[PDB]
Design a protein around this nucleic acid. Structure first.
Ligand SMILES: [Mg+2]
Ligand SMILES: [Mg+2]
Ligand SMILES: [Mg+2]
Ligand SMILES: [Mg+2]
Ligand SMILES: [Mg+2]
Ligand SMILES: [Mg+2]
Ligand SMILES: [Mg+2]
Ligand SMILES: [Mg+2]
Ligand SMILES: [Mg+2]
Ligand SMILES: [Mg+2]
Ligand SMILES: [Mg+2]
Ligand SMILES: [Mg+2]
Ligand SMILES: [Mg+2]
Ligand SMILES: [Mg+2]
Ligand SMILES: [Mg+2]
Ligand SMILES: [Mg+2]
Ligand SMILES: [Mg+2]
Ligand SMILES: [Mg+2]
Ligand SMILES: [Mg+2]
Ligand SMILES: [Mg+2]
Ligand SMILES: [Mg+2]
Ligand SMILES: [Mg+2]
Ligand SMILES: [Mg+2]
Ligand SMILES: [Mg+2]
Ligand SMILES: [Mg+2]
Ligand SMILES: [Mg+2]
Ligand SMILES: [Mg+2]
Ligand SMILES: [Mg+2]
Ligand SMILES: [Mg+2]
Ligand SMILES: [Mg+2]
Ligand SMILES: [Mg+2]
Ligand SMILES: [Mg+2]
Ligand SMILES: [Mg+2]
Ligand SMILES: [Mg+2]
Ligand SMILES: [Mg+2]
Ligand SMILES: [Mg+2]
Ligand SMILES: [Mg+2]
Ligand SMILES: [Mg+2]
Ligand SMILES: [Mg+2]
Lengths: 157, 98, 217, 57, 112, 146, 46, 49
RNA sequence: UGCUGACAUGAGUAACGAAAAAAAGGUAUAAACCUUUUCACCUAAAACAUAAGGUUUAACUAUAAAAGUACGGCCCCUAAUUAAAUUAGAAUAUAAAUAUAUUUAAGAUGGGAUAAUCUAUAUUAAUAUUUAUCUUAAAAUAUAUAAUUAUAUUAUAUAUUAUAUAUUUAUAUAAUAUAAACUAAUAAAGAUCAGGAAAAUUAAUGUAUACCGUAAUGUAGACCGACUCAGGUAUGUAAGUAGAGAAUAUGAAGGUGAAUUAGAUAAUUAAAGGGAAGGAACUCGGCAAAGAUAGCUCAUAAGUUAGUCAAUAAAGAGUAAUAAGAACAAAGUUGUACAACUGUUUACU
RNA sequence: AUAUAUUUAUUAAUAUAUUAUCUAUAUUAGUUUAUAUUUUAAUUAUUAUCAUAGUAGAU
């Protein structure tokens, strides 16, 4: 009489209305999970009703839903998985090349909107200043690459 | 064409133009003249048209009267084959046609 | 066999009143990868609609693909008549044609650019297309309503048109835009699609319930 | 000119630092024919179906 | 063909620096630019002055930049939520760093 | 090939007037539409709750904490095994989840620090390491209790 | 015709013939792996 | 510095080789480290393990 | 012609690898980067969409979004084939290693339900290679005055008008509407070279829909060739005009115009165009170059193994061409030696 | 059709200037065309590019 998609929709509606899970909870209970998730800054292709996380590679879509709901009360209406690639790198040419980690990221659809806080101004917070790190690296590369008479060339760092 | 000048083949208008009975045939596996070691043990044998081997009867144990339904060309041999049907039970069989 | 479906041809108001498969409405979908917008008369679409709407694609306005995950419903506009629904669909397609072929120079004149003079993008995602789609919807609705305005009780007061948005944030300023006398007189409202279920996956169910509500106002 | 700051041939590649390297590194999800499936230990949840679907346990 | 013996320092140096056609010539044909007393080449214009006039032309004929209204009247929070930042690759970083692979012309000396 | 002996083809047949079926659509789009400026989506239309559960990923609703906001290492210490020995199962469970939530906040701050600004302050890292120390102490205690 | 392009890459064949299992599932391949271990090589097989 | 390296432990062998440098070659790395840092950053004492 | 390392001579020489580019502005910074306009080049591609491969090279770290109905993989099933697996003391044989036969497991380049009026896979109740689409049919038209032929049609793809509804879902349908190509589903039928394997229905409950691929490159600067190498590399679409055609000419959209530029254009070298008088006098040799008087419809000999084999005969005719005025297909006879013929061969003399 | 200026207590004819000669439906599945319907969506004089300098007669 009712399609299974319609039945799923009424299931989710009933869950929200009754305040319980909007999904079916599994039987493999995990009392002490040590998984960590990383909230990410929105992209131009997302809407204020979406949030993206960096999650464990062995993580799952249902796992993210359950984790968010039970630990934070956030209801993810639709979850979507984006598993990234690992590019080859080598800290120097005289070392074995090895692939970078493959990071897993999931986007969740929410019910109420969210906008991140403002960027801090350079003078407000000490950790949020790229001048000192970037200048240190530029001095690093200049000193490592100054071969001959460039040692007397005035530096720009 | 020069390839048709010396092509002769007997024609039997009574032969059956359709397919054989599938239940009495098996796919014929091609070996290429190579044995279980993969080496050519019989030369000059190789690629050809896909074929099915027909399970024809050489024992004729059953007995009784059987009517020949049709005569067919069997690519796995040189003689024609005859499809039989038993008068009492109706089971179908293949034999060498005289 | 019955090769031809409802979504195959372009269906006029006579067809819509003969079948009554859906009430008078037009669907507008957003592409989650390229930011483009697709218009349809039905809750679904096929390759013919994509071909009709992306006629002259370039490295900026690439021709999108029919992978159902990247297509999502932006809005559902509910009108008072099948004539008006067809009129609005035709207006939207015509204005897309004007924007991409006939009057591309002025479309570009108005678009945003970054350094190097390219239309602003993040990846292959260009926000300007959704905004242009909303502007075209406003313009087409304005023309559609301007065409006919009985403003009298001939047989019934008739129902009031609506726009069901995926999210209130998509439409711009409600006062600097969407604040004209035609819309106010017709009583156009701006409603929202309910978020009480997996909207992306159960899109069809949600839209069908909305269609039933509109059919029985 | 690939890079406007290098007008002459000096050894720099179109992209990257080295064209060669070790190829005996372990594989991952992005590499292989369409038939290759490695996985991420994220789904031992249910049973595959005889037709191709998947039923959650 | 192929050399049969290594050429001596004498032979190489006299072959290269010996003949006068291979030697750079002192530039005698310099004079004073009438618009500014600086050095310039004879039967040639002065780059400082030519560029100055071209700069005047640019400042007086530049086409007004195009700043769309919908963008110029857009709030900072909306700009941040619609047009977020991004990370520039090494290629674009170097490309943006322009003063390390482009040289401006150098002024000549004042002729007195 | 088109030689010069070629003969032009005739025009293909045309159905007479009295037999042509009229089109089902007799009216079309308006020939007066004009290209209008795009309308950006405005955030003024949103009512974002201040108690949104995504704020639990920030401390005091700060984008990224300052050295002053962080807890000084002198005043902080991880839990001890004997102190966790006599905490009920509910208390250990709740402490575990509080630790995980704090670690998530520190994780996002540390990711922004090491990915965007690329600094080597390594403060959030050691703070999360202290939390992890408490966590495995809790695990040890529960195992030994059973 | 021209030569030099003898290596035509294909991960399927590369793994089937030079993969770790392709050697660990036999006497001879096991010996190759063991010899490389004894020499101390970092990478035993593709 | 966009690396994601702070999220996974990849190249364990190489990392251990770099972090367990032989003690008799330490001056080799000491030289580059010293000459690649500013005066207000460096100290005249030998880093210890 | 010792080995390694450093540095020389050739030498600031040869080269910078098929190529259309020019101004103005970004910038009194630019041949080389970006933008605009002009000009060109590829266009049955140098375009679009993909497979394989690869130092992510991409429109990038805020980064490539799937329950399925055009989503692939994963999974069920197997082909070729593989397997320290498998078989009363005893499967067989064997210097060891090991090799046979049988089972079982694995293994695509293959097969696998439903679905836009959108759909439902699970548990308990029984155990069809390959190839072709008629001389002849019926109406109305062009038809002639009995022709007979000239054709939609001698078979399918859908939308409108009317005869009806269960409070207009499925039908019985009579009319209206196609020019040339192509597609997937029928029906009938031709030769011999005779054309894969494998996993079974109703009921009652049941479905909260896992994992992985998804960027860009992909007749290539993003793979295999030691190079940003004129080489090698798998599919589908591939505007219109013109044609028998996917030939050839153009090129609408798209993409592009290149790690070399500006002058000058000696001898000489390469690729290309023209040539008075003569026409193989060159040379070992007509090597190279030149030579086409329809491409459609006619017509086409001697020999002959009877096969328009010779034959795409040669020469010739019809069709506007009469001083000529695109590209492409089409390059003459004859004797002899050898070999029946199509085919295969010394990857690189 | 836009823009500046008027013939009454948007705007008609002029001075001109700028931009365009499109789209969209039907004819049983898809592509092309052809004709109907919709729309303002045109038919004369010069010019250029490409086809070996595209081609032949001169110079
Ligand atoms: Mg996925
Ligand atoms: Mg023999
Ligand atoms: Mg869906
Ligand atoms: Mg390579
Ligand atoms: Mg791949
Ligand atoms: Mg090699
Ligand atoms: Mg092999
Ligand atoms: Mg020389
Ligand atoms: Mg020379
Ligand atoms: Mg030279
Ligand atoms: Mg310039
Ligand atoms: Mg061609
Ligand atoms: Mg063509
Ligand atoms: Mg491509
Ligand atoms: Mg799938
Ligand atoms: Mg199997
Ligand atoms: Mg397969
Ligand atoms: Mg791909
Ligand atoms: Mg793609
Ligand atoms: Mg080579
Ligand atoms: Mg190449
Ligand atoms: Mg062509
Ligand atoms: Mg063009
Ligand atoms: Mg390209
Ligand atoms: Mg070049
Ligand atoms: Mg020259
Ligand atoms: Mg001559
Ligand atoms: Mg002559
Ligand atoms: Mg002679
Ligand atoms: Mg002679
Ligand atoms: Mg010749
Ligand atoms: Mg004769
Ligand atoms: Mg004769
Ligand atoms: Mg020829
Ligand atoms: Mg021969
Ligand atoms: Mg031959
Ligand atoms: Mg040879
Ligand atoms: Mg051309
Ligand atoms: Mg030319």
């Amino acid at each position: 009489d009712i399609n299974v998609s319609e039945k799923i929709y009424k299931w989710t509606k009933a869950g929200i209305e009754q305040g319980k899970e909007h999904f079916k909870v599994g039987g493999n209970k995990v009392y002490f999970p040590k998984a960590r998730i990383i909230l990410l800054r929105p992209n131009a292709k997302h809407t204020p009703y979406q949030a993206k996380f960096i999650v464990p590679k062995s993580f799952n879509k249902l796992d993210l839903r359950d984790y968010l709901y039970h630990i934070y009360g956030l209801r993810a209406m639709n979850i979507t998985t984006q598993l990234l690639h690992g590019k080859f790198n080598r800290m120097n040419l005289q070392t074995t090349r090895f692939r970078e980690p493959q990071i897993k990221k999931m986007t969740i659809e929410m019910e109420e909107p969210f906008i991140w806080p403002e960027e801090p101004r350079p003078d407000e917070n000490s950790f949020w200043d790229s001048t000192t790190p970037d200048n240190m690296e530029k001095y690093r590369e200049e000193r490592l690459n100054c071969l001959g008479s460039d040692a007397n060339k005035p530096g720009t760092a | 064409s020069p390839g048709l000048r010396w092509y002769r083949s007997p024609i039997y208008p009574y032969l059956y133009k359709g397919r054989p009975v599938r239940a009495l045939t098996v796919v014929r596996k091609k070996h290429g003249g190579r044995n279980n070691s993969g080496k050519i043990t019989v030369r000059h044998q190789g690629g050809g048209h896909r074929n099915r081997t027909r399970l024809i009867d050489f024992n004729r144990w059953e007995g009784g009267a059987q009517t020949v339904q049709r005569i067919e060309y069997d690519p796995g041999r040189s003689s024609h084959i005859a499809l039989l049907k038993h008068n009492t039970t109706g089971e179908l069989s293949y034999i060498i046609a005289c | 066999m019955k090769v031809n479906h409802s979504i195959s041809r372009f269906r006029p108001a006579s067809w819509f009143e003969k079948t009554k498969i859906i009430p008078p409405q037009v669907y507008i979908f957003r592409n989650l990868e390229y930011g483009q917008v697709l218009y349809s008369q039905f809750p679904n679409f096929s390759q013919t609609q994509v071909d009709k709407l992306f006629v002259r694609p370039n490295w900026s306005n690439r021709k999108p693909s029919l992978r159902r995950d990247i297509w999502k419903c932006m809005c559902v506009v509910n009108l008072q008549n099948y004539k008006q629904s067809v009129h609005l669909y035709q207006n939207l397609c015509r204005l897309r044609y004007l924007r991409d072929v006939a009057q591309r120079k002025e479309s570009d004149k108005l678009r945003k650019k970054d350094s190097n003079g390219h239309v602003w993008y993040s990846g292959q995602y260009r926000p300007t297309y959704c905004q242009e789609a909303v502007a075209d919807l406003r313009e087409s609705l304005l023309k559609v309503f301007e065409n006919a305005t009985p403003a009298e009780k001939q047989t019934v007061p008739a129902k009031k048109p609506s726009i069901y948005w995926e999210d209130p944030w998509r439409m711009g300023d409600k006062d600097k835009h969407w604040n004209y006398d035609v819309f106010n007189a017709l009583g156009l409202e701006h409603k929202l699609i309910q978020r009480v279920g997996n909207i992306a996956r159960e899109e069809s169910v949600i839209l069908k319930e909305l269609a039933k509500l509109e059919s029985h106002p | 000119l690939t890079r406007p700051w290098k007008k002459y041939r000096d050894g720099e590649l179109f992209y990257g630092l080295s064209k060669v390297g070790n190829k005996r590194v372990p594989l991952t999800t992005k590499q292989g024919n369409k038939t290759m499936y490695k996985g991420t230990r994220a789904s031992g949840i249910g049973r595959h179906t005889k037709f191709g679907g998947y039923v959650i346990n | 063909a192929v050399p049969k013996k290594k050429v001596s320092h004498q032979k190489k140096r006299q072959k290269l620096y010996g003949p006068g056609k291979k030697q750079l010539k002192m530039i005698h044909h310099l004079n004073k630019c009438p618009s500014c007393g600086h050095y310039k080449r004879a039967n040639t214009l002065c780059m400082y002055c030519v560029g100055q006039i071209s700069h005047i032309w640019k400042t007086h004929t530049a086409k007004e930049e195009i700043k769309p209204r919908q963008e110029e009247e857009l709030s900072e929070l909306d700009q941040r939520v619609l047009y977020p930042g991004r990370r520039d690759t090494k290629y674009t970083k170097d490309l943006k760093d322009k003063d390390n692979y482009l040289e401006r012309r150098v002024r000549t000396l004042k002729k007195d | 090939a088109r030689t010069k002996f070629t003969k032009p083809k005739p025009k293909q047949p045309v159905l007479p007037k009295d037999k042509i079926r009229p089109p089902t659509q007799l009216t079309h789009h308006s020939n007066n539409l004009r290209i209008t400026e795009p309308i950006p989506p405005t955030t003024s239309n949103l009512r974002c709750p201040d108690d949104h559960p995504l704020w639990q990923f920030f401390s005091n609703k700060k984008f990224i904490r300052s050295a002053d906001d962080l807890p000084p290492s002198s005043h902080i210490r991880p839990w001890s095994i004997p102190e966790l020995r006599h905490k009920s199962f509910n208390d250990l469970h709740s402490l575990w989840y509080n630790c995980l939530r704090e670690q998530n906040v520190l994780a996002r701050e540390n990711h922004l620090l090491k990915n965007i600004v690329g600094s080597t302050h390594d403060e959030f890292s050691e703070l999360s390491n202290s939390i992890r120390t408490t966590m495995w102490q809790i695990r040890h205690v529960l195992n030994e209790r059973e | 015709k021209s030569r030099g392009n003898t290596y035509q890459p294909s991960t399927l064949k590369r793994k089937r013939t030079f993969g770790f299992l392709a050697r660990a599932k036999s006497k001879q391949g096991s010996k190759i792996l063991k010899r490389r271990k004894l020499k101390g090589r970092w990478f035993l097989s593709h | 510095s966009g690396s994601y390296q702070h999220l996974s432990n990849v190249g364990s062998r190489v990392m251990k080789r770099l972090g367990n440098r032989p003690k008799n070659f330490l001056p080799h790395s000491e030289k580059f480290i010293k000459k690649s840092t500013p005066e207000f950053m460096k100290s005249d004492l030998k880093e210890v393990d």
